[PDB]
Amino acid sequence: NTFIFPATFMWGTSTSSYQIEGGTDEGGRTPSIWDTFCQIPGKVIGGDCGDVACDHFHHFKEDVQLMKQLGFLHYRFSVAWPRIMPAAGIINEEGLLFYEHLLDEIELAGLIPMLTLYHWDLPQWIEDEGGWTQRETIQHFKTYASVIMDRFGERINWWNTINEPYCASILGYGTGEHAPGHENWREAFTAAHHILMCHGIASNLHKEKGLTGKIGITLNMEHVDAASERPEDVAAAIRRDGFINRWFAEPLFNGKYPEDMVEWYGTYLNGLDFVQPGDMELIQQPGDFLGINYYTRSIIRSTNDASLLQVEQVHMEEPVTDMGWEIHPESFYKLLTRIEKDFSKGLPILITENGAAMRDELVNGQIEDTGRQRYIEEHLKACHRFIEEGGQLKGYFVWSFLDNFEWAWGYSKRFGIVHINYETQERTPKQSALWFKQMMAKNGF
Numbered sequence: 074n075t076f077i078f079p080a081t082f083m084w085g086t087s088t089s090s091y092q093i094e095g096g097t098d099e100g101g102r103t104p105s106i107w108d109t110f111c112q113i114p115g116k117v118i119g120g121d122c123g124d125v126a127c128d129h130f131h132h133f134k135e136d137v138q139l140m141k142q143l144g145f146l147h148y149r150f151s152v153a154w155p156r157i158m159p160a161a162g163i164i165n166e167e168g169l170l171f172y173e174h175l176l177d178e179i180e181l182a183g184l185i186p187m188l189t190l191y192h193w194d195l196p197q198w199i200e201d202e203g204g205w206t207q208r209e210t211i212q213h214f215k216t217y218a219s220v221i222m223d224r225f226g227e228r229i230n231w232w233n234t235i236n237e238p239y240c241a242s243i244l245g246y247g248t249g250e251h252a253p254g255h256e257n258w259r260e261a262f263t264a265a266h267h268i269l270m271c272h273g274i275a276s277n278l279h280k281e282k283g284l285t286g287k288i289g290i291t292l293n294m295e296h297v298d299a300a301s302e303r304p305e306d307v308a309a310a311i312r313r314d315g316f317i318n319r320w321f322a323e324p325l326f327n328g329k330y331p332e333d334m335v336e337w338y339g340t341y342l343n344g345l346d347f348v349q350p351g352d353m354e355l356i357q358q359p360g361d362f363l364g365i366n367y368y369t370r371s372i373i374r375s376t377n378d379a380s381l382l383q384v385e386q387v388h389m390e391e392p393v394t395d396m397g398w399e400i401h402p403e404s405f406y407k408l409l410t411r412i413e414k415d416f417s418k419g420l421p422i423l424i425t426e427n428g429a430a431m432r433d434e435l436v437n438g439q440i441e442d443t444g445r446q447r448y449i450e451e452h453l454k455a456c457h458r459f460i461e462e463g464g465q466l467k468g469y470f471v472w473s474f475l476d477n478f479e480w481a482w483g484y485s486k487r488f489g490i491v492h493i494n495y496e497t498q499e500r501t502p503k504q505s506a507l508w509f510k511q512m513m514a515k516n517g518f
C-alpha cells in the first residue's frame with residue numbers, strides 16, 4: 074500500500090505576488106486592482122488588504138532557504154505587474170531588481186523556478202483605462218511580458234502565463250467577487266477573451282525570442298456532478314462544467330468557445346463582437362504543459378432564478394476544509410482522467426496548485442495539521458492512480474508554502490504548509506511540511 078511517484082516527477086511549492094510580498098508602496102510599486110478592491114466595504118472578510126501580508130518582499134532570502142531546508146527542488150511564484158510597469162510605459166528597474174535578487178537566491182539554493190506572469194494583480198492605472206475589458210490592455214501586457222522575458226528567460230526553465238483566467242474574468246468583472254469588482258457579464262466574457270489572448274501573446278513572445286523554458290497556461294478546473302438523475306439537474310451540471318472548464322479549455326486546445334455556452338449566454342456575448350480575426354488562433358496554443366489547479370468538486374442542481382447559469386450548488390457538509398470546501402479526492406482522479414481524454418490528450422499535465430485551509434492551532438511550538446494532511450496525501454493518491462494508468466502527470470506543487478492573504482477571505486484562511494505568525498512575521502513549518510519533506514525524500518509515501 075505504498076505510493077511511489079516517477080523518478081522525474083516534479084515536486085514543488087507555489088505562491089502569489091500580492092498574497093505574500095507586502096511592500097505595496099515600496100520600491101516604486103503602484104497600487105494594483107486588489108489594493109483598491111480590498112478597501113471596498115464587504116468585499117474582503119474583516120476588511121483585510123494585502124498590505125504587508127507575509128512581508129516576503131523583505132523575507133525572501135529566508136523563505137527560499139526555508140524551501141531548501143524543506144527539500145523542495147521547484148518553486149512557482151508570480152511577478153507583480155505593478156512592480157514592473159508602475160505607470161504607462163516606464164519600466165521600474167527597482168521592481169525588476171527585486172525579482173532578479175529573488176532568482177539569485179533560488180539559483181543559489183539549487184531550486185528550479187517557474188515564473189507566473191499574471192496572478193490577478195493588474196496595475197490600477199490599467200484598470201482606469203478600462204482594465205481587461207479593453208483590447209488595449211493586451212498591448213500593455215505585451216510590454217510587460219516582453220520586459221520580463223528579456224531581462225530573464227535565460228534562467229527561467231518554466232513559464233506559467235496566466236493563472237486561472239476564469240477567476241480574473243468571471244469573478245473579477247462578472248460576479249463582483251474578485252477585483253476589480255464589476256458585475257457585468259458582457260464585460261466578464263470580454264475580459265476572459267482578452268486574458269486568454271494574453272496567454273497567446275506571451276506564447277508568441279516566447280517563440281519570437283527563442284527561449285528554451287517550457288511554457289504553458291494554468292487553468293483552475295473542477296469536477297462537476299449532478300445533484301440527481303433529474304434531467305434538468307444533469308443539464309444544470311453540463312452548464313456549470315462549460316462555465317468554468319470548457320469555456321477556457323476549449324479555446325486553448327480546440328480553438329473555439331463551447332457552442333452550448335455561447336448559445337446560453339445569448340445577448341451577453343453581443344454576437345461575439347469582441348472576437349476579432351486571428352484571436353482564436355492566437356489563444357489556441359497549448360504549449361509544453363497544461364497547468365491545473367484543483368481543490369474540490371461541485372454538485373449541481375437547476376433553478377429558474379435570475380442568475381446567469383440558473384444553477385444551484387449543493388453544499389456538502391461532509392469532509393470539508395475551513396472554507397466549507399468538500400474534500401473529495403476521487404473527483405480529482407476523475408477530473409484528471411477527463412482532462413487527458415479531451416483537450417490534453419497526452420500533453421504533460423502539471424498541478425500548479427492543490428491544498429487546503431484547515432483551522433490551525435500552535436501547540437508546543439508545532440502545528441499538528443493532521444487535516445491538511447489527510448488532504449494532501451489523499452489527493453496525491455488520486456494523482457498516483459491517474460499515473461500508473463497512463464496519465465501524463467509530470468509534477469505537483471502544493472499550494473501555499475506560507476499562510477497568506479487568501480483574497481476575499483483575507484487572512485482568516487490559512488493555506489500554508491508553513492505557519493506565519495502575523496504579529497512577528499516568524500515562519501514555523503507545520504507537520505504537513507515535515508511530512509512533505511520525508512515524502513519527497515522517499516519520493517512517495
Ligand SMILES: OC[C@H]1O[C@@H](O)[C@H](O)[C@@H](O)[C@@H]1O
Binds near residue numbers: 366426
Ligand atoms: O482558495 C484560494 C486559492 O485559490 C486558487 O485557485 C488561487 O489560484 C490561489 O491564488 C488562492 O490562494
